């Protein structure tokens, strides 16, 4: 819908650590919440195992905060453009 992979995305100018949190997660429908928890670390996914409520320290972390910050920085660096993704797939071909 809105740019999510190019250095010109508005996300590259957005505080992602404050965007993605417990309230924002609560804004999502239950099926979305389940499919999203299926992508969390196994301890937090296990903690959440019909609106799903996340651990108070599931997203408010030290590792998820750094994940958000580095994700924005990688987006700015252009790591997520489809050309770089295909280049990394060529590299993965070279590895295997």
């Amino acid at each position: 819908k809105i740019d999510l992979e190019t250095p010109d995305s508005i996300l590259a100018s957005t505080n992602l650590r404050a965007l993605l949190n417990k309230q924002t997660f609560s804004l999502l429908p239950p099926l979305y919440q389940y499919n999203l928890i299926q992508l969390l670390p196994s301890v937090d996914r296990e903690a959440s195992e019909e609106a799903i409520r996340l651990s108070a320290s599931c997203l408010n972390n030290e590792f998820f905060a750094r994940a958000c910050l580095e994700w924005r920085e990688r987006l700015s660096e252009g790591e997520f453009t489809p050309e770089n993704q295909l280049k990394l797939k060529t590299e993965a071909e070279r590895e295997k």
């Binding site: 505080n15 992602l16 965007l19 924002t24 804004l27 999502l28 999203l36 992508l39 301890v43 030290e62």
Partner: protein
């Protein structure tokens, strides 16, 4: 010189690493206060950062496990091994892989021991399992470790990046006090971490609880038998039972504290090694698809 992944400096990380080496009676804990008493430490690991009496006998340096760091990013493993493999049979059981590594490197030169470390698939796998995704993709300043350990009535300072093991140890009265003196000589700060290799606290607490509970059962059985039978006084049995119950309560609280601390170690490890990319991507995509990404983004623009 192949290269391992880079690890963070965390006592819980190192505890889980040693557990993944198959050595299950060891735990690493950080030393905030040097003067606070530590009970039964196998050794110490000193990490330094951002800063500017040698055993030289070729038979003496080979008669002890002084390994030389050949693999570049294996510093935490190297220090932990320099501490553990210089311990004996009485207190701890090393893993099967660690005992095999120890017997395999009995009389080898420091270089050969470092190479044995680097070419042990179990150790490399367990070490790289604790790396963050940042380290993995970076593979395509950190800390410097130094181990302190008592061998035979002498404190040894092992540095994997130095030619000779530093022996400067003797005490008479307890090696913890000698180590405290040596550390106070060279020395809160962020350029220094100090960690102690200690026995698993959970194990000692569980055993103390077992002893307390069996003693409490004995005295309660004798007491209830006496009172049922219905002569002699029973004050002292009741006093014994009261003090036993108090100690059992204290140690149950100790066990609960240690259990939640171990659980915190587990969750920090599970988060530290997780790749949050797909989660962030799908979260942002679902926010956009729901129509609410725009408002939130408008509320959290970085100041410029």
């Amino acid at each position: 010189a192949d290269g391992w992944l880079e690890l963070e400096s965390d006592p819980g990380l190192f505890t889980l690493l040693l557990k993944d080496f198959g050595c299950h009676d060891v735990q690493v804990e950080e030393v905030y206060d040097l003067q606070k008493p530590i009970e039964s430490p196998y050794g110490f690991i000193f990490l330094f950062r951002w800063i500017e009496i040698f055993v030289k006998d070729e038979e003496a340096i080979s008669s002890i496990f002084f390994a030389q760091q050949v693999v570049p990013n294996s510093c935490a493993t190297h220090a932990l091994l320099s501490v553990l493999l210089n311990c004996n049979e009485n207190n701890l059981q090393l893993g099967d892989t660690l005992s095999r590594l120890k017997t395999h490197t009995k009389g080898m030169s420091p270089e050969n021991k470092g190479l044995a470390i680097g070419n042990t698939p179990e150790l490399a796998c367990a070490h790289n399992s604790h790396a963050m995704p940042q380290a993995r993709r970076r593979l395509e300043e950190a800390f410097h470790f130094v181990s302190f350990v008592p061998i035979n009535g002498q404190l040894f300072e092992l540095d994997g990046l130095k030619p000779y093991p530093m022996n400067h140890g003797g005490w008479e009265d307890d090696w913890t006090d000698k180590f405290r003196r040596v550390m106070a000589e060279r020395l809160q700060d962020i350029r220094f971490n100090l960690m102690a290799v200690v026995p698993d606290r959970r194990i000692a607490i569980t055993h103390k609880l077992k002893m307390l509970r069996t003693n409490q059962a004995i005295v309660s059985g004798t007491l209830q038998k006496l009172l049922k039978a219905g002569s002699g006084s029973a004050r002292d049995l009741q006093s014994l039972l009261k003090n036993l119950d108090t100690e059992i309560a204290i140690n149950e609280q100790h066990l609960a504290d240690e259990n939640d601390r171990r659980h915190m170690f587990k969750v920090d490890a599970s988060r530290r090694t997780h790749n949050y990319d797909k989660f962030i991507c799908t979260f942002l995509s679902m926010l956009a698809h729901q129509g609410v990404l725009g408002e939130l983004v408008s509320q959290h623009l970085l100041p410029s």
